[PDB]
Design an enzyme around this catalytic site. Structure first.
Site, PDB file in Angstrom:
ATOM      1  N   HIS B 713       0.844  -1.182   0.000  1.00 26.42           N
ATOM      2  CA  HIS B 713       0.000   0.000   0.000  1.00 26.42           C
ATOM      3  C   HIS B 713       0.881   1.234   0.000  1.00 26.42           C
ATOM      4  O   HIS B 713       2.009   1.217   0.501  1.00 26.42           O
ATOM      5  CB  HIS B 713      -0.941   0.033   1.212  1.00 26.42           C
ATOM      6  CG  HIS B 713      -0.235  -0.009   2.531  1.00 26.42           C
ATOM      7  ND1 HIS B 713       0.553  -1.069   2.925  1.00 26.42           N
ATOM      8  CD2 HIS B 713      -0.206   0.880   3.552  1.00 26.42           C
ATOM      9  CE1 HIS B 713       1.041  -0.829   4.129  1.00 26.42           C
ATOM     10  NE2 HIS B 713       0.595   0.346   4.533  1.00 26.42           N
ATOM     11  N   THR B 715       1.078   4.713   1.616  1.00 23.15           N
ATOM     12  CA  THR B 715       0.569   5.617   2.641  1.00 23.15           C
ATOM     13  C   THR B 715       0.544   7.005   2.021  1.00 23.15           C
ATOM     14  O   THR B 715       1.559   7.701   1.985  1.00 23.15           O
ATOM     15  CB  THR B 715       1.442   5.577   3.890  1.00 23.15           C
ATOM     16  OG1 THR B 715       1.574   4.225   4.342  1.00 23.15           O
ATOM     17  CG2 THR B 715       0.829   6.418   4.996  1.00 23.15           C
ATOM     18  N   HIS B 792       6.023   6.260  -1.148  1.00 28.08           N
ATOM     19  CA  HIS B 792       6.725   4.999  -1.323  1.00 28.08           C
ATOM     20  C   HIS B 792       5.783   3.854  -0.987  1.00 28.08           C
ATOM     21  O   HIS B 792       4.902   3.988  -0.131  1.00 28.08           O
ATOM     22  CB  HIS B 792       7.971   4.909  -0.433  1.00 28.08           C
ATOM     23  CG  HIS B 792       7.658   4.825   1.030  1.00 28.08           C
ATOM     24  ND1 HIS B 792       7.121   5.879   1.738  1.00 28.08           N
ATOM     25  CD2 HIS B 792       7.767   3.801   1.909  1.00 28.08           C
ATOM     26  CE1 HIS B 792       6.938   5.514   2.995  1.00 28.08           C
ATOM     27  NE2 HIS B 792       7.320   4.257   3.124  1.00 28.08           N
ATOM     28  N   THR B 794       6.217   0.368   0.629  1.00 28.85           N
ATOM     29  CA  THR B 794       7.118  -0.537   1.326  1.00 28.85           C
ATOM     30  C   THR B 794       6.959  -1.943   0.773  1.00 28.85           C
ATOM     31  O   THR B 794       5.840  -2.447   0.635  1.00 28.85           O
ATOM     32  CB  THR B 794       6.852  -0.521   2.832  1.00 28.85           C
ATOM     33  OG1 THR B 794       6.551   0.815   3.255  1.00 28.85           O
ATOM     34  CG2 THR B 794       8.065  -1.037   3.594  1.00 28.85           C
TER      35      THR B 794
END
Ligand code: 5GP
Ligand code: 5GP
EC number: 3.1.4.-
Lengths: 830, 830
Positions: B713, B715, B792, B794
C-alpha cells in the site's frame, strides 16, 4: 590595582617590579583618589590609613594591611580577590606547578585512575571549593587561600573527545604559562558564591537568567531561585534525527562514569527545583561508588537513600545492600529517583549481552513508571540503552559526557510525562542522539522572556548580550526594571561598531548612554564587585571582553562618593600626560583651544573650566567604572555636594571631547560625548542670554596697567531679564555680598582678547562666578552666554603688546547692576 | 538586462560581445521568465512578442523593438533608461568625447569664458535637460536622446576650490574612462523628473525628505510639495564662530557669479514655497546678465521683473533700465526680491572702495527692510559685505560658491525676520563665515521628524538610512505608513554587519524581513523603476550601494505577477549551475540532502519539493527585486493563483537555505532564511500529525517488483483527528475522487528508505498530494508530518539491493481510510 599598606616603622625597601610608593596625612578620601591615579600595578602604602584602605576596597581596588613582611609581603606578588568584609584573600596563582601537582575542586576525581595518565611523578591534590583546604599553607594576619585550580583543563578534556591525556595536560599547562591570567573566570567563582546568598536573604524572589554549567554547584542550596536556560531535548524532537548505527567513540582515558552520574542527578535536582521550590529527597538505585555526593554535600545538606550490593560511603542511609525490585512503597512522596542499573558485562557473546541489557532497560523504565504513577510531586531519571522502544513525547533526554560513547542514554520523567502520548522510537534515532548530541548544560529550563518583572530580582550575569537576542528588548529591560543585576558588552571598539564577535559568534555592544535608567548604578566589574564587598588586584584592560554591570534599584545609588566613584579616572590620563605627550599642559591647552579660548592660553593650568567629564569621555575604556551619568544627576539635585559645579562647566568638557574624538577619528567617543551633552541639557534646562539687556559689573579702585578707556570694569555677569525681575536679581546679589567682596582678586598680565581688544586677566573670581551662575539658574533667571565666560578688564580697543607684572591684588570699590546700552546703573552696593 | 527584439525576417547575425539569442511561441509570460534567466548582458529576441516585451518592461528589464538594424541596433551598444509608456530612450553614454566636446545641462555656462580653459580645440555644447536637444542626432523608430552630461565634473570643480581647470577636466575624464558607468546617478535624474509629476497629480499631499542640490530644478514647478532638509544657517549661530580677517581665495578660473546668483534666487524660491504653497513673483535688482533664467524657465514658467542699467535678455518684463532706489510701491504683495547691487570697482584705493561698498551694503539692507515692512506674504535676499553690522538673529545666511572668496555674503529675510531682535555682528565673524562655510544645499528647510503621517505621501529617496538616524524610528515609519516611497540600504554584507560605511561615514543596513509591512511592495531600483513606467539596461550588482525601495499603499501590490515579479530569480542560479558547479544537479541534490531525503537521491530532478524560496534566500543580493514576502502572502490568500503550493514546500526550502548558509558561513543569509521561515509559520498556522491516529492509503492492483509483505500500500496521507471528523475527511476525499484516480501513477525503481526498509518509488502523485494537503489545512484538519513526505510502497523490512525497471504504470484499485494500529478501515471508495 593591588594597594598594599605596610607599617611605616617597618618600611622595608626592595626593588620589586611595577611597584610604587604613596603616603600622606592631609585627607582620607583624597589619599584614596591620589592612590587611585597612580600608574603602576602594585602600590606600597606607608601612612596606611584604615579609612583610606576601606575607601579603596569599596571602589574595587584591593587594599590590605601587611604585617608579616617576611612572608605576607612576598607571597602577594600574584593577583587575588579580596573579601574585605570578612578579611579573606583568594589567590589566583598557578605557582603550585612547582610542586608537580594538578589542583581540582572536586573530590570524586581523586578516586579515579587519573594519576596514571599524568606526567611521571605528577599528582593531583584536592584543594576544596575556591581552595578552602589550602588555608593551612598560608598562616598570615588574614585568612588566606589559593582559589586557582586546573579544573577548566580537566573539563575541557572531557568535552574535547581527544584521547591522550598526557599531551593534553602538557599542552594546556604550557598554554597557561604563555597567556595572561584568567582573572574574570577565577574571581567570578568567588563573586557567584558570595553574591547569590546575599540576594536570597536580601530579596523575596530571585530570577537567574542563563546559568551555565560552571555554576551548577552554586544554586544547589537555593531552590528559591527560578532559573531560565536553553530549552531541553524533548523526545518528540527526535523525529528530525537521521537514523544511525552503533559507534564506539572513546573520549577519556580514565573512567568518568561518576561525572556522568553526578551531572544526571544534579540535572534532576534542578528540574525538581524548577517545578517545586523545595529540596527533594534523593533516591538512588545502582550508583554503588557514589563518591561525588561529598562534593554536593559541600554546598547543601541532602538526604540520600542508596540501593546497591556494593557499599556507598557518603550516603545518608544505605537503605539496603540488597537490590531494589518491588520496594516501590518505601519511596516517599516528595523526591527524585535515579535508576542506574547495569546487570553485568557477561562473558557471553555481544548479541546475547545485548538482549540481556535490553530486557534490563525495559525493567528500569517500568520501574520509573511505577515510581511516578503512585504519588504527587516527584521526578525520576533512568538509564536506558539504544533499542526500539516507546517513550513519552514530552520526556527529557540526557546524554552527559561519559567514558565511552557506547549505546546508553538517560530519560528524565516528571509525573506529567507518565500519562502522556507515547511514541515509537527506533534504535537508529536513539543512536543518532547518543552519537551526535552531548548535553552541554544541566540547567534544562525554558528560555527567559526578556520582559520587566515587578516582583522579581532578575540576575543576568552573562546571558542577555548575544547576537540573536532582541536589542531593544534588552534596552527596555535594563531601562525599566527595578531591583536587578544585568550585564552587557561595553563597545570599546573605535568606529562605533554595534556588534563584536569571534569566529562567527557575535555580541551586541552598548555604551553607558544607550540606557536611560532612572535609579541605577552602571559600573565595571570592579565597581559591581565592590558594591557586593569584594575587591580585586587587576583592573579591566581597555581592549577586552569587558562588561558593563547595571544594578537597578540598589541601596548604593545615592552614596555617590562611596561606590562606583571617580577612583582611577585619571590613572590613564596621568600616564599619558607624563610619559608620551608633547607637554604635560596639553590637556588644559587642548581644552581651552577646543572651547575657542585660544585668545590667551597663558598659564591656563590655573582656573580651567572643564571637569571630570573630559576624562570620563576620552578614557572611558579604562575608567568606565565611574558611572558618569549618576555623577551628573546626583550633582544636579543637591538633596553639588563637594564640588558645586555649574552645568556650562560640564558642557564645555563635552565639546572638548567631541573635538578630540574627531581629531583621533574615535567615532565611539564622538557619539558618547554627544549623548552625554544631550543628557546634560536634559537634566539642566540651560538658558543663554546671547542678547542681553542688563549686566552685572565690578569696578576696581586701582589698575596696575596703562588703560585707554574711561571706565575700567569687570563684566562679571550678563543676563536677560524683564524689568520686574530687577529686585530678584538684586536680592541674589545681596545674598553673597560678603562672598563677593571676600574673593582674592588678582591680576598678573595683559593680553589681546580679540582683534581690536586689549584686556587684563582677572584671577580667583571664577569659582564665585559659578556659585552665582547656579543661584541665577535655580532662580529661573537667564544668566550667562553661549560662549565661555572669560573674566577680563578691557583696557583699550587698540592692538597692544602683552605685558606681565608680579601678582598684584585688585580691590573692589563697588559692585553695580547696569542696563546694557543704558548709562543708567540700577544698583550700586559698596 | 537590455533585451532587444528585432524582426525575425531580418534576423541579422554578428558576433557582438555578451549577446544571447532567444525566441519561442509557447507562452507569453514564460518567454519573459526564460529571457529573464539568461546570463549575459544583451539578449536578442527573434519571435519578438509584444506582450513579452511589455512584461519585461514592467519588470524593469529594458525591452524595445528594433527596426533599423543598420543604425538603431548598432547605436544601442550602450546602456540607457527606457520610458516604455512614452516609448523614449535616454542614452547614458560618453562616446561624445570623440567630438572633442563637454556636455552640460545648463545654458548659462555657455555665456562664460569657460571654453578658453578647456583643452585646445575642445568645446562645450548645451544638450538640454537629460539631453532633450540631442533628439536631432538620433532619428529612430523611437524618440531617442543622450542623457549623459559632464555637469558632475563642473559642479565638483566649483566646490573643489582647486584652481587649474585644464588638469581637472583631464583628470576627471580619464577617471570616467577608468571606472564603470554611474548608472544610478544618471537614471535617477530621469526617474525624479517622471516620478514627482505623477505623485503631485495622483496624490493630495506630497512630502519629500532630504532633497539634495542635484534635484534643485526638479521641484521648481511643484510648490505643493513640502520639503524637509537640514537646518539653515541662522545669524544667532555666528556667536560660536572665531573671528577672522580677509582671505582672498580663488576657487574657479572662469566667472561663476551667475551660478551664485541662481542658487541664491532658487533658495529664496524654495523658502517662499515652504512658507506659502504658491509660486511667487520674482523681483530682481542688479543681476544684469541674468542668463540662468532660461534654465529655470525650462522647468516652470515664472514672472520676472528686472532693474538694471544694462540689458537682461530672458526677463519677463525689464521694468526699468534705470536704477531702483525709492520705487518700493511698484512691488506687489506676494513676491520675493533679490538685491544684488555692487556700485563699481572704482580705480581708487582699496580702503576708499571699502567705505563705498560698506555704505552701499547698508543701503541694500535698508532697502530690504522697507520691502518687507510694507506687505504680507513676501520674502527677500540681499547682497551684503563683511563689516560690523546689526542683523536680525533669526535671519538666514547664504554663501554659495562664487568665483573668489572676497568679503561678500547674502542674507535671506522673511517678514518674521524684520521686526525681530537684532544683534551686533563684527566683521570678523562674517569673514569667518565667508571663509569657513560654503552653503551646501539650496533646501534650507527644517529637518524631517520621522513619524508616520496619515494625510501625507512621504518620499524618502536617499535620506533616511544614515548612521545617526534612529533605526527603530525608521523601521516604524516604513512599517506603519500608508502611501509612501522610502529607500534604505540593503545589507548585502556577509557576517550580518548592521552598518556599512566609507571613510567614517556609515549607513544602517536592513534585510527585507526587518520590516513587517502589511500592504507594500519591497523591491529593487529595477522593480520600483518598473512600477513607475521605466526600465533599465543594467541590473544591480550584488556588491554595491544597492538600496531597497519600499512602496506603501500602492495600486500594484495585488498585481503579483505584473510588478516586482520573479523575473531574473534564476539568472545567477543558472550561471552558477552550468559554469562552475560540481554538477548541474547540485541544487536538487543539496535540497534533498538538506531535508534528510538522502535515502534516495536517484533522479530527484523530477518532483522535488523546494520552491522559489531557495533562490530568493541564497541569491538575494542578485534577485532581491522579487519581494519574496509579498509572493508568500498573496499565495497564502488565493482571493496559489498559478502554483497552489503547500506551505511545507516553502518551509523545506527555508531549511535548505539555512544549511547552505552555515556551510558557506554566510551569516546574513542564515538570518534572512530563519526570518522568512518565521514569516511563513506566522502566515500559515501549520500543524503536524507527528503522532497519527488515522491514515489515508492507496492500494494497487499490480506490483512490478518482488514484495515480501502481505499488503502493498501507498501511505498517501497521515493525519491526527478526533473520531467526529471522519465524515469531514471522507467528504474531502470525495471532493477529489476523480482527481485521485486521474493521476498517472508510475514507478521505475526500488531503493532502501532506511535501515531495514525496502520500498519502491512512486511518481506523479506529489502534486495531487499537495492539493490535498491544502484542502485538509484549509478545513482545519491536521495533515502531514514534521518530516518531508516521501511517497513509497514498502516492499519488505529486509536489506535488499536496488533494482531498476522501465517506467511501469501502476493502477489504483481502492483508496481507503484506516485507523492506525486498527485493522479497521473506515472508508473504501473504488
Ligand atoms: N575643571 C576641572 N578640572 C579638574 C577637575 N578634576 C580634575 N581636574 C584637573 O585634571 C587634572 C588631572 O587630570 P589630567 O588633566 O591630568 O587628565 C588636575 O590637575 C586638575 O587640574 C574638575 O572637577 N574640574
Ligand atoms: N519545487 C520547485 N522547484 C522550482 C520552482 N521553480 C523553479 N524550480 C526549479 O528550479 C530550477 C531552476 O532553478 P535552479 O535550480 O537552476 O536554481 C528548475 O529547473 C526547477 O526544477 C518551484 O516553484 N518549485
Amino acid at each position: 590595582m593591588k594597594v598594599l599598606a605596610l607599617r611605616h616603622s617597618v618600611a622595608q625597601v626592595y626593588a620589586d617590579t611595577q611597584i610604587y610608593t604613596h603616603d600622606d596625612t592631609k585627607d582620607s578620601y583624597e589619599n584614596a583618589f591620589l592612590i587611585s591615579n597612580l600608574t603602576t600595578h602594585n602600590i606600597l602604602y606607608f601612612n596606611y590609613s584604615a579609612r583610606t584602605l576601606e575607601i579603596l576596597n569599596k571602589s574595587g581596588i584591593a587594599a590590605i594591611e601587611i604585617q608579616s613582611l617576611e612572608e605576607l609581603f612576598t607571597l602577594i606578588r600574584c593577583n587575588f580577590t579580596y573579601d574585605y568584609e570578612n578579611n579573606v584573600v583568594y589567590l589566583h596563582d598557578y605557582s603550585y606547578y612547582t610542586n608537580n601537582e594538578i589542583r581540582t575542586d572536586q573530590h570524586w576525581i581523586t578516586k579515579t585512575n587519573i594519576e596514571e595518565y599524568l606526567l611521571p611523578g605528577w599528582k593531583l591534590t584536592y584543594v576544596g571549593y575556591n581552595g578552602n583546604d589550602t588555608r593551612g599553607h598560608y598562616n598570615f594576619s588574614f585568612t588566606c587561600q589559593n582559589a586557582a585550580t586546573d579544573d577548566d583543563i580537566i573539563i575541557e578534556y572531557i568535552y574535547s573527545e581527544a584521547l591522550d591525556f598526557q599531551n593534553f595536560m602538557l599542552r594546556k599547562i604550557k598554554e597557561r604559562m604563555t597567556t595572561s591570567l584568567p582573572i574574570a573566570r577565577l574571581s567570578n567563582r568567588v563573586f557567584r558564591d558570595k553574591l547569590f546568598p546575599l540576594l536570597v536573604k536580601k530579596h523575596k524572589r530571585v530570577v537567574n537568567v542563563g546559568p551555565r554549567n560552571e555554576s551548577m554547584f552554586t544554586f544547589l542550596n537555593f531552590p528559591s531561585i527560578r532559573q531560565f536556560s536553553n530549552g531541553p531535548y524533548l523526545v518528540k524532537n527526535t523525529i528530525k534525527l537521521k537514523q544511525e548505527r552503533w559507534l564506539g567513540k572513546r573520549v577519556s582515558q580514565f573512567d568518568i562514569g561518576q561525572y556522568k552520574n553526578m551531572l544526571n542527578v544534579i540535572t534532576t535536582i534542578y528540574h525538581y527545583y524548577n517545578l517545586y521550590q523545595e529540596k527533594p529527597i534523593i533516591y538512588m538505585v545502582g550508583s554503588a561508588p557514589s563518591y561525588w555526593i561529598y562534593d554536593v554535600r559541600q554546598y547543601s545538606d541532602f538526604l540520600f537513600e542508596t540501593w546497591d550490593p556494593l557499599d556507598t560511603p557518603y550516603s545518608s542511609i544505605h537503605h539496603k545492600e540488597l537490590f531494589f525490585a518491588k520496594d516501590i512503597g518505601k519511596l516517599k512522596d516528595n523526591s527524585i529517583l535515579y535508576i542506574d542499573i547495569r546487570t553485568d558485562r557477561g562473558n557471553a557473546d555481544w548479541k546475547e549481552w545485548r538482549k540481556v541489557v535490553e530486557l534490563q532497560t525495559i525493567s528500569n523504565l517500568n520501574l520509573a513508571y511505577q515510581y511516578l504513577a503512585t504519588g504527587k510531586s516527584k521526578v525520576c531519571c533512568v538509564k536506558l540503552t539504544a533499542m526500539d522502544l516507546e517513550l513519552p513525547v514530552s520526556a527529557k533526554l540526557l546524554h552527559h559526557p561519559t567514558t565511552e560513547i557506547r549505546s546508553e542514554f538517560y530519560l528524565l520523567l516528571d509525573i506529567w510525562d507518565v500519562n502522556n502520548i507515547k511514541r515509537f522510537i527506533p534504535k537508529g534515532a536513539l543512536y543518532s542522539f547518543i552519537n551526535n548530541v552531548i548535553t552541554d548544560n544541566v540547567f534544562i529550563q525554558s528560555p527567559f522572556k526578556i520582559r520587566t518583572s515587578v516582583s522579581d530580582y532578575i540576575v543576568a550575569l552573562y546571558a542577555l548580550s548575544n547576537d540573536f537576542n532582541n536589542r531593544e528588548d534588552i534596552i527596555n529591560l535594563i531601562n525599566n526594571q527595578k531591583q536587578s543585576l544585568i550585564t552587557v558588552r561595553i563597545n570599546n571598539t573605535f568606529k562605533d561598531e554595534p556588534k563584536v564577535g569571534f569566529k562567527s559568534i557575535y555580541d551586541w555592544t552598548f555604551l553607558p548612554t544607550d540606557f536611560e535608567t532612572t535609579n541605577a548604578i552602571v559600573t565595571s566589574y570592579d565597581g559591581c564587585l565592590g558594591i557586593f564587598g569584594l575587591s580585586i588586584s587587576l583592573a579591566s584592560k581597555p581592549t577586552g571582553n569587558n562588561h558593563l554591570f547595571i544594578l537597578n534599584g540598589t541601596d548604593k545609588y545615592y552614596k555617590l562618593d562611596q561606590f562606583a566613584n571617580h577612583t582611577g579616572i585619571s590613572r590613564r590620563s596621568h600616564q599619558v600626560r607624563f610619559s608620551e605627550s608633547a607637554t604635560s599642559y596639553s590637556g588644559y591647552i587642548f581644552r581651552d583651544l577646543s572651547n575657542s579660548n585660544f585668545n590667551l592660553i597663558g598659564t591656563n593650568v590655573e582656573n580651567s573650566v572643564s571637569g571630570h567629564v573630559y576624562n570620563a569621555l576620552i578614557y572611558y575604556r579604562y575608567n568606565y567604572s565611574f558611572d558618569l551619568k549618576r555623577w551628573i544627576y546626583l550633582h544636579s539635585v543637591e538633596k553639588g555636594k563637594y564640588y558645586e559645579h555649574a552645568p556650562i562647566e560640564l558642557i564645555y568638557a563635552c565639546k572638548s571631547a567631541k573635538e578630540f574624538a574627531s581629531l583621533q577619528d574615535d567615532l565611539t567617543v564622538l557619539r558618547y560625548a554627544n549623548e552625554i551633552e544631550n543628557y546634560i541639557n536634559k537634566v539642566y534646562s540651560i538658558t543663554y542670554a546671547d542678547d542681553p539687556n542688563y549686566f552685572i559689573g565690578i569696578k576696581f579702585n586701582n589698575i596696575p596697567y596703562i588703560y585707554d578707556v574711561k571706565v575700567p570694569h569687570l563684566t562679571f555677569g550678563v543676563l536677560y531679564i524683564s524689568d520686574n525681575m530687577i529686585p530678584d536679581v538684586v536680592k541674589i546679589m545681596k545674598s553673597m555680598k560678603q562672598e563677593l567682596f571676600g574673593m582674592d582678586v588678582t591680576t598678573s598680565y595683559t593680553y589681546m582678547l580679540s582683534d581690536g581688544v586689549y584686556v587684563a586677566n582677572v584671577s580667583g573670581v571664577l569659582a564665585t562666578y559659578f556659585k552665582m551662575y547656579n543661584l541665577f539658574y535655580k532662580n529661573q533667571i537667564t544668566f550667562g552666554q553661549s560662549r565661555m565666560f572669560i573674566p577680563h578688564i578691557t583696557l583699550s580697543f587698540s592692538n597692544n603688546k602683552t605685558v606681565r607684572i608680579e601678582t598684584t591684588k585688585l580691590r573692589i570699590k563697588s559692585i553695580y547692576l547696569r542696563k546694557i546700552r543704558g548709562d543708567t546703573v540700577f544698583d550700586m552696593p559698596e
